[PDB]
Design a protein around this ligand. Structure first.
Ligand SMILES: [Zn+2]
Lengths: 193, 191
């Protein structure tokens, strides 16, 4: 039962979470508001559960009603350690909320709260991604080109950004995938490192 | 697909644009060479209506966006998923509509029951006390790059003059590019 996973995660019943996750080893937790088990864990701050679920293969980029993903939830909590873990495991750094349209980095510190400095980490990635890791990057989603100069992506592809920048598109990275090259939306990428 | 064929009609309808330049400070800038407007998402875009004889009372002015490339011309131009759902309503504009008219309490929006194409209309007002044209302030609510929306595909804006009954009196159009650096892009594209 999904409700079991949601609340044990929220409540921090790690033994329980571990028991029922197999009794729907297809969690697919969404809840009527869009909050999943991974949202609850990140929110209540249960690193071990956060670790377990992600490790289990829970989608790191689940978005709720207002577009909040677990990274948005980690950053609002100024949790750099959880942020470093999620990114490490596939967080969509550029996923934005739908209303104020902001990224996780922008969510850091409710207001003065529990010392930000988390922002720097996230802001670092948004700025070093595609260039660090020797320009390597990974596709968190598939991508069907609209325009001819766009690289076709697929769930999880490794590629090297042949630089990016302002000149032509801020939202679009110029990458080399396999042996081909083209435009890729930075919104579906992650370091995946 | 909606027609983009110029029509001056019995009143001599044509469009005018401000002669701003390509300074990095410009918010909106039109290129005569390219018959293309370069503007910033949601800023004022003055579009002027030039006419030879004054249109009869009840005349209306309408605007609509269409994709420029033939391979995309049948896809209705609308805002991307995020923009469609962000909180930027002015309380008059439908959330999916790309083009808005600012500063006019008499603006009207349309979702075509049959074509599903969006458009905005406002009453025609003749030139001011000491003026030679009538200006309409537009706003474009998505960037040309908007993934999921225009997704880096060029579009055109079509302006049409129509009687109170909806009949065509005139039509004109121009290409549009919504970008962060209007002046820079115009210079580079003209280069
Ligand atoms: Zn948009």
């Amino acid at each position: 039962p999904l409700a079991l996973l949601l609340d044990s995660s929220l409540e921090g019943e790690f033994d329980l979470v571990q028991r029922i996750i197999y009794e729907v080893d297809d969690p697919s937790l969404p809840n009527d508001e869009g909050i999943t088990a991974l949202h609850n864990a990140v929110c209540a701050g249960h690193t071990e559960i956060v670790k377990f679920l992600v490790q289990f293969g829970v989608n790191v980029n689940a978005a709720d009603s207002d577009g909040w993903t677990p990274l948005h939830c980690a950053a609002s909590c100024n949790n750099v350690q959880v942020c470093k873990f999620l990114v490490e495991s596939g967080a969509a750094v550029f996923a934005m909320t739908y209303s104020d349209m902001q990224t996780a980095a922008d969510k850091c510190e409710e207001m003065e709260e529990g010392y930000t400095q988390c922002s720097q980490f996230l802001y670092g990635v948004q700025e070093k991604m595609g260039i660090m890791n020797k320009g390597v990057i990974y596709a968190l989603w598939d991508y069907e080109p609209q325009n001819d100069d766009e690289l076709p992506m697929k769930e999880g592809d490794c590629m090297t950004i042949i630089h990016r920048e302002d000149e032509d598109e801020i939202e679009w990275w110029w990458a080399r995938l396999n042996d081909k090259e083209g435009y890729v939306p930075r919104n579906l990428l992650g370091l995946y490192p | 697909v909606p027609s983009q064929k110029t029509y001056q009609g019995s009143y001599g309808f044509r469009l005018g644009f401000l002669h701003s330049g390509t300074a990095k400070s410009v918010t909106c800038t039109y290129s005569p060479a390219l018959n293309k407007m370069f503007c910033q998402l949601a800023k004022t875009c003055p579009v002027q209506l030039w006419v030879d004889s004054t249109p009869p009372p009840g005349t209306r002015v309408r605007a609509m966006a269409i994709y420029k490339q033939s391979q995309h011309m049948t896809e209705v131009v609308r805002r991307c998923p995020h923009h469609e759902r962000c909180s930027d309503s002015d309380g008059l504009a439908p959330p999916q509509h790309l083009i808005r008219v600012e500063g006019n309490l008499r603006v009207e929006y349309l979702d075509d029951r049959n074509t599903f194409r969006h458009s905005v209309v406002v009453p025609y007002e003749p030139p001011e006390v000491g003026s030679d044209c009538t200006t309409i302030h537009y706003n474009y609510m998505c960037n040309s790059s908007c993934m999921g929306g225009m997704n880096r595909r060029p579009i055109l804006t079509i302006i049409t003059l129509e009687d109170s009954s909806g009949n065509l009196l005139g039509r004109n159009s121009f290409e549009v590019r919504v970008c962060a650096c209007p002046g820079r892009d115009r210079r580079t594209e003209e280069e």
